[PDB]
Amino acid sequence: PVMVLENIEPEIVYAGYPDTAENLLSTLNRLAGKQMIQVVKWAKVLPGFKNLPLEDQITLIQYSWMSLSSFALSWRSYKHTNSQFLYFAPDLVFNEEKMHQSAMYELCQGMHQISLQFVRLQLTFEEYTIMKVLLLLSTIPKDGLKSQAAFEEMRTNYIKELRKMVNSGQSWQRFYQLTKLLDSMHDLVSDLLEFCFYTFRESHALKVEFPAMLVEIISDQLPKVESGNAKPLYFH
């Protein structure tokens, strides 16, 4: 299970870099689209997930895109900079000045904080790989998926997989700590989507530009989300 996840990790992606809000947001949107490809490529080979109906795989991916991009961001941020900065790309690294010019300073701070958690925890690559899959399996539609049961067994197997990876008392505490971090991610992710949705909606007036693959994902996602019909699963 776990050895496979270690092999399948994604490739380096460049953002392709005046530091105006419009420019940074547009660059972030552009980075997210390229990353989206890596996400699809990664998800495709995931054990269990690949046997799921295709429509189901896509639905899961669209729902969890922001969350996946974020978790991956903390991890790059953790490894490359000891969580000092937000390491979006080798060519796009934020500091407090960048967060400010970005116009997303507080959201960025929350993200950095999640990142700091990785250091406090000393998150292993083994823990990180599992949690990522779990994030991909965290938000479902209200009426569910085409094969809800199938999704359910695999989500459960994966939770069990994470518990294996984490004395008994300490292990249980770690499992609590990681599951809690996943919940906290969702709170932050929800805020990012709200902001992303608004800029998307107010795109022409704002001058913030989104890539085509992303435009497709967002247009579809926004009604079901703001409507409260995306069922995000919470551990605690």
Ligand SMILES: O=C1COc2ccc(/C=C3\c4ccccc4COc4cc(F)ccc43)cc2N1
């Ligand atoms: O116009 C907007 C406003 O809302 C957003 C909100 C969020 C993002 C994308 C982020 C972003 C920005 C701040 C904190 C976490 C994240 C999620 O991690 C990412 C990882 C990437 F590889 C590339 C872009 C992002 C983009 C937009 N676009």
